[PDB]
């Protein structure tokens, strides 16, 4: 917004004082994991177990 | 930190003393006088036995542009160097006003008004009639009302008495032509019979000092009132009538200002009548003076709003008889009074009213007592010895000097700013476009030559006195037949030159047959522009080729005609490659001294010429080729820089002012007299200060105040440098984003650049607080900080009203005004930025491997006085000595806080980092005074200076070769001479001293460099073909001309037109970058002609420029020191 | 006079919040030209009674730019200027006996 | 009274809020009102025309 | 209080005004002066003399 | 200067000496005061013909 | 639409006194639009961004380009495969009340 | 208020027109009102003229 080289300034509501949104991974991306049950990996002693 | 660094070796540690000379004498310590009183300080500086500025160091009495000078004496090789300092006396940029209010308040809750009225009319019964309605009315005012803040508003009255003293003293001569007095014009501007303003007369001693009713007509002992044909004037009334008219006005003020005089100082009576004329005029707006320059007001006369008229109220009869006292006509021993003149009485008054009016310009009047600087200093002493204002004159000096003194800023005098930011935009907004049109026109016309006695018959040969332009010309000058296909310049650049200038083919190349006879070059060496040409100064076959020659080509004895000016501007720009475009042309004009731009504005506007350029050159196209310079602006006003930008004119303090402080009314002084007549208001210290103003001349006062203006401007330069006060910094405080780079402002738009934690409220308190702390340490006692607090006084900084569109690219140029050497002059060798280079050290021979930039060899981390921009500035001055440019890139990495956009680099300050240096107008003689723009960069940004890719490049022209020819005008071009017999014409325009042997010893040392590296050669050779007399055949003309050189100094025939090898390049398809020049023109361009040189880096280039930097710098340097002194006080 | 309206632009009647954002320059820029630090220094019927309330100057030149050095003077430059001014020993302390 | 330039209150932007005055919370201020913001925002708009 | 207030009034110099010698519209003016940008405005109040 | 008058004040504060909105009308081009332009606006009847 | 990002590699030469060099890396994928993946050619949600496959031991600075929001070449939502036995692929349609 | 060829286009002319010098007659008053509401779209109906 030039208007003859006249640039105004945002004095209190600029990029430095902008209210950012606290974000987690689950905010943006889908969790493809059911809370109803768990998948237990096959953990025995030997490979044949 | 995400950036990969490269390993490097440690660098040579350097300090300021490595590159820059200390201009302080180690042999002569000038001592100073003690004193901590401010009234005593005025007495110490005003002693006739001391001088602040010597009279040969002051060009004060000029129509604008008062300069004050200093000399640097080298104590080794005994060469000197003169430095100037330019002040303005135009009112175009004043912006400070002062007003005094005569507000009276009530007092004495119980004091019985009727018993004072008895004392008043009984004490004054011996002068004024006791039972009258005026003595009862004025004794009623004194008994009930006192004045609000009296005898402290005597600052304003002494402010205006000093303003008038300087107004009549900084004018070429106090004539009626130089000092008009405001008259009373009716419609159509005719005076109304005496020209005296109707309500408040000041050409008569009747409004001030009304007559006595006891001495008026009809009083017992006096004659009866005369009849109608010679009746007394209507506006003359006795004093007791005037007292009946005193009243409290709507503004709670008194009608007048009563200055009651009990006993009178014993001045010669003719000096009492003169200071009364002054006391009557100090009340009027602008001191009662008229507009004497540019139809505007003076530096001192402007901003004086005035006050109510003074009423001289004699409490005794010794002032009434002092005015009419006649002391002339007696020439006895012990009886003669020098310069005494009989009183001049207004007719039909009872010899009671003195008449001040004399003849003026037309029917206008003129008070000759106002044009005498003695009558303005007499009135100061009269008021001190009658009213006690000793402590208020010291405040009056410091307030007058700050308000009424203005410098010129770096843009005009040191920096290479274009005409857009150097000149007034309201007038010179199309001067670059129109001057480009003029040159593009003349360069593409075939200026034909008159045939043999053929009335109106012309020949296609261009006339001899107008050399053919190498690039856009028509044919070879040294051709037997110009019609030959071999002698025909290629027309590849001609039409695009006129399309660039005018547009879309509205002007075409053609013939001009208006000057086919020849130019009448004048013998008037004062006004001659033809004296500069090498061809007009031929030398014999045995004469030294370095000889200046003798000007033997004048023809007429008048002043320089119009066609002579056209020739000078024709030849000045002929060889300059900066005609390829209007954008490149304006960059050329940016490097011209301001004293040459004034001569181009006289030409561009036809100020003094008989006929306009269009009439001279037969120009008949729609677009205009001239500019409308105002009516007031003369040739002498333009030469005094009446065209400068009113924003580059900085007050001595970096602040403006609008003071309204309630002042003297005189009711408190007259009330205390009636109570007890045995006291005085004037103290014995005020009677001593009054005595010196009786015994003083304008010369003594001028140096006192032109020394204060220097002292305060050096304290403001310190404050500007400390707080980085520039247009960008002030605009940031006002809430704007001022930046020369437009994309830098778009990126800074939404961030926290503009804060409430950075405002003008705080930036002004920093400036005023720190400035008025230096001013005390310098013993100046300025009241900027005090007046800032008052409710009705406003103190503001300098750039509160700048034009954002025009001065956008000047956003980062600090507000320092005076030259880096004039700061050392005033501040005892101290410096801010950096001035003269050094010869005591070999900083130019340091060579390190695989470092690409010169100034990357040096390490300024440990230096306390030296900075990362002090080496870049030093290198730019080092290279400019050899005639070379170092292009520095400066950049602001702006990453928006909290925003994810890419961090961006913005090239800043590319108006000055892209154009070459300039011979400063402060000291235009030596190259060492050409100061780098990097020293006037300020701002609240973090920058990264770095060498541009192949930044080391030759300048447009060698500024060491250009020099002014005389002090009067700005005749400026390549100069030569300096032989065993002659001397180089190297003069300082507006200079104060004549250049002595130590100034021409500098030229002599510089001209005797090895291999003639300090001079530009001249040669006598065929350079045209004059038309043979009584035929149509052209015989070769033998012409003295220049020799075109290279970077390395080589001289080949291919660099030149007028030579077969060099003209062959022009006849082929050539561009604007071809190195072919016409040596018959006054400016020669640099280039890499037939050398293997290209654009290298600064470190490799400075090694390559061996002799042109090392040898030149050795001849331009001594151990300079200041053996002068600006700060002298008596014990 | 000159009637104003939408012309050849895709502007319609909208809400206040979306329309103030949409007309960005014609409000923020004009406010800078129109507004100021307006103050009344006069009152009829009353006189200004001054107060000592610690007039405020800005504590620091806030520098912007993420890379580089600033343009501040070298740390020993104004110190050398003060020392030179102290040598002249002209410091004024009294005005007619009054400090 | 008249408007201010001390702050960039005209640059405050928010999601889904349709009214300009609804962007500001006057509740903590004992000084200012709900018709004060609406009256101000009519003076803010009148600046732009 | 009147004694205190008689020292003041609407009419000052380049700060206030009084246009009362009219055909029925007396006004009182006052200039509001800006410090940051040197912007000044003038305000009036109109009195009905009819 | 822009003709910004005060239709009932005196030959004083704003009508004579002070400039009101000296900055809005001055430093602003596309979003400030309206622009003027010289171009063919009408046709004047030629003299001695139709 | 497409958001253009930049990975910048900066090399400093403060000991040479010449301007630093800034270089662009990973431009093959940051300058070309996202693609309907073969792993899951059914939804736009399955088109994966190249920033997740950026690896390396070099120090880059990731920042969004200036005015990087531009439309794609074609709208990848509308493209789908017609057969499971070859690669017929074009703009598709037909999810009606019956088809 | 016409302007020069290379003057500042955002200038204020010097009012070259005006032939009589007596007083603004009725026709000059009519012209001023003619141009004041000339391009006002509020002349469609009396209600919006109000």
Author numbering:
A (entry chain A): 2 to 50
B (entry chain B): 11 to 1141
C (entry chain A): 1093 to 1191
D (entry chain A): 845 to 893
E (entry chain A): 51 to 100
F (entry chain A): 993 to 1042
G (entry chain A): 894 to 992
H (entry chain A): 547 to 596
Question: What wording appears in the published article?
Answer:
Rosellinia necatrix megabirnavirus 1-W779 (RnMBV1) is a non-enveloped icosahedral double-stranded (ds)RNA virus that infects the ascomycete fungus Rosellinia necatrix, a causative agent that induces a lethal plant disease white root rot. RnMBV1 is a potential viro-control approach agent for restraining and controlling the white root rot disease, because the virus can confer hypovirulence to its host fungus. RnMBV1 is an approximately 52 nm bipartite dsRNA mycovirus composed of dsRNA-1 (8.9 kbp in length, AB512282) and dsRNA-2 (7.2 kbp in length, AB512283). The RnMBV1 capsid is composed of 120 chemically identical MCP subunits and additional surface CrPs.
The 3D reconstructions of the full and empty RnMBV1 particles were performed with 12,230 full or 14,602 empty particles, and were then generated with the icosahedral (I) input symmetry. Finally, both maps were generated at an overall resolution of 3.2 Å using the “gold-standard” Fourier shell correlation (FSC) = 0.143 criterion. Each MCP_A proximally surrounds the 5-fold axis, while MCP_B is located distally from the 5-fold and otherwise encompasses the 3-fold capsid intermediates. The amino acid residues Ser2–Lys1193 were modeled for MCP_A, while Ser11–Val1236 were assigned for MCP_B in accordance with the reconstructed full-particle cryo-EM map. In each MCP_B of the RnMBV1 capsid, there is an extra-long 111-amino-acid-residue (Leu1126–Val1236) C-terminal arm/loop, which goes across, interacts, and interlocks with three adjacent subunits in the order of MCP_B1 to A2, A1, B0, whereas that of MCP_A (Leu1126–Lys1193) interacts with only one adjacent subunit. Each full protrusion domain in the RnMBV1 MCP is composed of two fragments of the amino acid residues Ala433–Leu648 and Met965–Ala1125, which form 7 β-strands (Sp-A-G) and 13 α-helices (Hp-A-M). The protrusion domains of MCP_A subunits form dimers on the capsid surface (green rectangle in Fig 3C), while those of MCP_B subunits cluster to build a trimer around each 3-fold axis (yellow triangle in Fig 3C). Hence, for Megabirnaviridae viruses, the pores are also expected to exist; however, the 5-fold pore is obstructed in the RnMBV1 capsid. Positively charged residues Arg140 and Arg141 conformationally block the pore and contribute to positive surface charges.
